[PDB]
Design a protein around this nucleic acid. Structure first.
Lengths: 173, 99, 258, 175, 148
RNA sequence: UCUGCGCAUGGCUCAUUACAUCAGACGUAAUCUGCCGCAAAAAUCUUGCGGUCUCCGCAACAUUGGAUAACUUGGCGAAACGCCAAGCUAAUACAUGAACCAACCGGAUGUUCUCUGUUCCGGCGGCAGGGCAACCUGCUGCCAUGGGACGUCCAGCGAAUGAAUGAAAGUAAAACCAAUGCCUUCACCGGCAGUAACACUCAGAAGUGUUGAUUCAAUUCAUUCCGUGCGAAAGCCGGGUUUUUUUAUCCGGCGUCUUUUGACGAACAACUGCCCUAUCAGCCAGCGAUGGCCGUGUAGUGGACUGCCAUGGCGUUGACGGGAGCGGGGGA
RNA sequence: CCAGAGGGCGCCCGUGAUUUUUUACUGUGACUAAAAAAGUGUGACCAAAGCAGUCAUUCGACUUGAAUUAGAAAGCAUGGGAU
């Protein structure tokens, strides 16, 4: 797959640099509507290279961004829902909602797996403030130091997922 | 004792010759610890850890490569399975609607 | 322990004469074997002609003005076998030794960034202590941490500017390949097939360009590149094609009429 | 001197080799080292590899191993019961590979009793384990029969493995 | 386990030194010899392993199947001259030498000794295949891979 | 003159010598290997000062110790590439010794306390009663398939022994038993959509060594090694910066220990071939002849060798013995 | 980022053969020191010889030449299938 430059150019210097840096190896930069480009290489050598680079690109006066294939990503993990987890939280039982109590806020959650030191908990959007207290610290419960943090994923979908799971079982049989 | 030079306290044995000006014969110190010698020893101390560290670093990189390959392998053999499973079963039970 | 060599018992790929002298140099042990190597003194004196005498070769080398593998050498006798880059920076010239067609040592002249490239055939792979894998080569070089896809008898592209190994090339399938030893030296062709005889030497059949197939031992295969348009390194004077005896003689005459 | 060669020996045809060559130092016997019991004494010899090999004289201790549980402990060599090669050897209590022997047996006892946090590990190890009867009787008394599975005459260390049921039952009956 | 005294007649015992088979288990009981611990080794030049080696009982340290004895460069063929000796046979190769002056061949035979594995026991006149192993006696250098 | 390296190569000569030696082809998974090449390296409780008990507290280009030649002095002997005593003094000779720097990887664990299993089939400890002293009964406390926190000990390379590892390729029904995960509810209810590994700090920091073939490479665990293994040469010489040179400001070139494997060689074994002679036809085993079994020895395989057991091995396709002869490439 | 269909090569292993199958010989090919011999080029003045040299015309060119064949058995691979 091919990647997506964002936050540069507009373009002018963009376009110039796009056809200046072809080839050896250096992709080619297809400038677009606003301030971003598609960058077409198909192999997925491109996804590996993009990590270790910050050469083969300049800016006119902008912060560069090299983003994976779709336009958006980072706002989605950051915000809109939460979603929360807590890791120092091994095995040896606290119990249930003593967990929830400690972190305040409203329910719903579980711990997993055997592995290890995390539990995962769904609380709305405003929990952004709550975790920004306990990651900042905090720093103890039981015999071990802590951190909490985020990225989003479900839900969204997870409830409808497991719904369609129980549904699937009956269908199969 | 220590903290005090040994370098001007070497024996100075005057030797005397006719028709040539007199000389002073005095020994080298071969066990003298000097700027140079000490500098070198410091460099030994530093580099002896460095190499061993860098070997380890290379190892950590190499093992990651093995990991990436076995990762993408896993990813495919999960992918193919999970895709075919649901698509198959769906198609089967949908064919019974028109049957 | 042998420390003397006689001109006749020495290779005549070094192109010594029957008369003049009685001895030839026996080189110090190193990357390459006695028959396949060519000693420093031979090169400098009899070919390049920066020396007219033995003593003059000591003068140049002991001092140091000569590098091989990009390392400077103070060695009077050292082997130079195959795929070795030698550089005299005083001239500013970079030679890459190879096998020329007709069994001759080639000395081929390369762009400066090609002289940092080198190709080493792998002989064994094995795991050493700490689980650290090792490819041991035909030049005795130890490549730490080779790729997990490495096999015996494959080539590893080797940067001499700073020591490491970029992507490999395999002996698999049809690929542009050249011969080492066996008196098909310097002849280049595709691998047509690889025969197996277990417990014995494995024949391989090569087909050079403009047909004319032939057979050589697996051991004598040394890979060059993926394809003839993907080669990383230069060819010697002839392209890796031999010609019939008649045509040799014909062309020798044609040029002699000038 | 002493040599190892086929060139002082008869052929398959019953004829005799004829010489033309004085003996090499490459071929080279040396006199056998005699490992017995008593105070440890070790006399090195230099060998062709540029390294030393050690002539065990009078080793009275060995590093012994118990099969199946993957362990080992040192203990004292007391007696030699038996040997394949000769009876003569056994009487002088020479130690050479594949002699059955007798050992102190004390550390093995000690170990096997160890085979609050501790306490439940024991109960788990007691489970799915058993031992041969002829073993345990001896191990109770504080003597055991073992075999010396390293050659002591060229390393000057005597290591052995302890007999287990199949093989133990044979050597026992030979006594 | 327990002794098998059919094999044994030795003052040294005999054990297989590759793999411990002397462990006591009930997993060597109610079975002929199949469940008993063995060592087995393939010969990869196209010499298929016998049944006997794999499932057997026999203890020999001078055959490639139950030992670390290895098969190397030369492989020859020859008949059986005699079956005499214990675990040693006598093979006779026969070939033809040529003489240029008379333009005519002659018959010349190498009478050779070999160590025959206790797996095989070929009759006189049978043909044998034999490999290249490390020295095993004064005369014996060979071993029996297969029998026809 | 001490030290290091070489002198075993070249050169010269054919006496022995016929399953020898050599030539072509082949193996050493049966072994050694200085110099040379590419490389590897995390064990180490040390040094200095002050007080002070041989004990502590600090500090950290590590700041180490002791002799011996030339020489000097007395000399000896007929001579001797023969030698003696005393006094000297060097090291990349010899003997010691490196904390901090220090990563990563586990196991044994502890009469350390913190969560814990809302029960009893088992165990352990204490107390009371009876006792044939073997044992039984009653009561109380702790532990039972678990993870954290803290303390302690072993951990490197090379070598020895035992044990494990060094994959696999003989169809797909669906609980029956315990542990346990995920999905799911509120629950220790229900249920199997998801799944490398994953009850921690790494959500990929080896689930996978090379070979036709391995008891090999390598990894793990348990005990070891005792000098006969392992110094960063406690080493030397330069280039500068930068004036104060004479300074922990930096860099370069040499030199050495151990480990590792290519090369140069060393040492074994075998496939095929070799002049005349029968007025040389039987040869071989007490004291090894042929083989098996266990050891011993060697760098290593092996009747190479000891002990035990077996009775074989070779021969008119010329064994054995004798005569002539270094073998081959090659000469006429 | 194709459900199904037979598949088509490559790789490794397992299983199956009423009796698999070999060799001499021959063709081709591998693998094989130099000196010596046969041989190609070349005016060392010729010649036994040697592997050299030759040319413009200068501050080098020839991509300078130094080919190639044979070399008993025995061993190696692969065609052929009469004797």
């Amino acid at each position: 797959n091919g990647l997506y430059v964002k936050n540069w150019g507009q373009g002018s210097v963009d376009d110039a640099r796009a056809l200046f840096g072809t080839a050896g190896k250096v992709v080619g930069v297809r400038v677009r509507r606003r301030r971003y480009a598609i960058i077409f290489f198909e192999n997925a050598a491109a996804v590996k290279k993009a990590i270790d680079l910050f050469n083969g690109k300049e800016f006119m006066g902008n912060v560069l961004s090299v983003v994976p294939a779709k336009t958006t990503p980072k706002p989605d993990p950051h915000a809109n829902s939460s979603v929360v987890f807590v890791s120092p939280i091994f095995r040896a039982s606290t119990t249930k909602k003593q967990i929830l109590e400690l972190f305040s806020g409203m329910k719903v959650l579980r711990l997993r797996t055997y592995r290890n030191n995390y539990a995962y908990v769904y609380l709305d959007t405003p929990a952004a403030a709550q975790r920004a207290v306990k990651e900042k610290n905090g720093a103890e419960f039981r015999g071990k130091q802590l951190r909490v943090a985020l990225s989003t994923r479900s839900l969204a979908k997870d409830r409808a997922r497991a719904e369609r799971a129980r549904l699937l079982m009956a269908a199969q049989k | 004792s220590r903290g005090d030079d040994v370098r001007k306290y070497v024996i100075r044995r005057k030797v005397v010759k006719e028709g040539k000006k007199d000389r002073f014969k005095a020994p080298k110190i071969q066990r003298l610890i000097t700027t140079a010698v000490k500098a070198r020893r410091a460099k030994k101390a530093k580099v002896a850890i460095e190499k061993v560290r860098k070997s380890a670093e290379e190892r950590r990189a190499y093992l990651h490569l093995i990991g990436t390959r076995r990762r993408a392998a896993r990813q495919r053999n999960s992918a193919r399975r999970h895709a075919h499973k649901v698509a198959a079963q769906k198609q089967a039970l949908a064919l019974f609607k028109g049957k | 322990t042998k420390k003397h060599l006689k001109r006749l018992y020495a290779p005549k790929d070094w192109m010594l004469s029957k008369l003049t002298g009685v001895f030839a140099p026996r080189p110090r042990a190193g990357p390459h074997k006695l028959r396949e190597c060519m000693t420093l003194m031979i090169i400098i004196r009899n070919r390049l002609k920066y020396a007219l005498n033995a003593a003059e070769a000591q003068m140049i080398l002991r001092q140091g003005l000569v590098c091989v593998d990009g390392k400077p050498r103070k060695d009077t006798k050292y082997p130079v076998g195959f795929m070795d880059v030698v550089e005299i920076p005083r001239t500013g010239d970079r030679f890459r030794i190879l096998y020329d067609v007709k069994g001759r040592f080639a000395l081929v002249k390369v762009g400066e960034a090609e002289g940092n490239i080198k190709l080493l055939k792998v002989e064994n792979v094995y795991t050493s202590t700490g689980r650290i894998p090792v490819a041991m080569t035909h030049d005795g070089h130890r490549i730490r941490y080779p790729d997990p896809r490495t096999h015996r008898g494959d080539t590893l592209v080797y940067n001499l500017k700073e020591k490491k190994v970029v992507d490999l090339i395999k002996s698999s399938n049809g690929k542009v390949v050249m011969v080492t030893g066996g008196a098909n030296r310097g002849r280049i062709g595709e691998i047509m097939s690889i025969e197996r005889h277990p417990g014995a030497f494995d024949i391989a059949r090569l087909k050079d360009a403009a047909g004319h197939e032939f057979a050589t031992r697996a051991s004598n295969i040394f890979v060059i590149g993926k394809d003839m348009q993907s080669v990383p390194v230069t060819l010697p004077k002839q392209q890796g094609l031999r010609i019939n005896v008649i045509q040799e003689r014909e062309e020798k005459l044609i040029a002699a009429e000038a | 001197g002493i040599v190892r060669s086929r060139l002082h020996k008869r052929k398959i045809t019953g004829g005799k080799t004829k010489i033309h060559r004085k003996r090499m130092k490459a071929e080279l016997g040396r006199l056998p080292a005699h490992t017995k019991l008593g105070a440890r004494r070790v006399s090195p010899v230099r060998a062709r590899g540029g390294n030393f090999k050690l002539r065990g004289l009078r080793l009275d201790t060995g590093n012994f191993a118990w099969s199946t549980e993957a362990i080992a402990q040192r203990a004292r060599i007391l007696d030699v019961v038996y040997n394949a090669t000769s009876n003569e050897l056994v009487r002088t209590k020479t130690l050479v590979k594949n002699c059955i022997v007798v050992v102190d047996a004390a550390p093995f006892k000690l170990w096997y009793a160890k085979h609050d946090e501790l306490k439940r590990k024991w109960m788990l190890r007691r489970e799915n384990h058993k031992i041969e009867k002829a073993v345990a009787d001896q191990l109770k008394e504080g003597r055991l029969l073992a075999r010396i599975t390293s050659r002591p005459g060229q390393t000057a260390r005597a290591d052995g493995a302890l007999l287990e049921g199949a093989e133990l039952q044979f050597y026992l009956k030979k006594l | 386990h327990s002794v098998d005294l059919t094999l044994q007649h030795e003052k040294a015992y005999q054990r297989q030194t590759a793999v411990n088979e002397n462990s006591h288990n009930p997993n060597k009981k109610h079975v002929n010899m199949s469940g008993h611990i063995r060592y087995s080794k393939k010969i990869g030049l196209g010499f298929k392993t016998p049944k006997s080696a794999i499932n057997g009982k026999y203890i020999d340290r001078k055959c490639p199947f139950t030992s670390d004895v290895s098969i190397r460069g030369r492989i020859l063929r020859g008949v059986v001259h005699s079956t005499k000796m214990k675990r040693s046979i006598v093979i006779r190769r026969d070939y033809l030498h040529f003489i240029r002056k008379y333009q005519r061949y002659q018959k010349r035979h190498r009478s050779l000794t070999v160590h025959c594995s206790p797996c095989f026991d070929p009759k006189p006149g049978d043909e044998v295949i034999v490999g290249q192993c490390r020295p095993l006696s004064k005369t014996i250098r060979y071993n029996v891979l297969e029998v026809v």
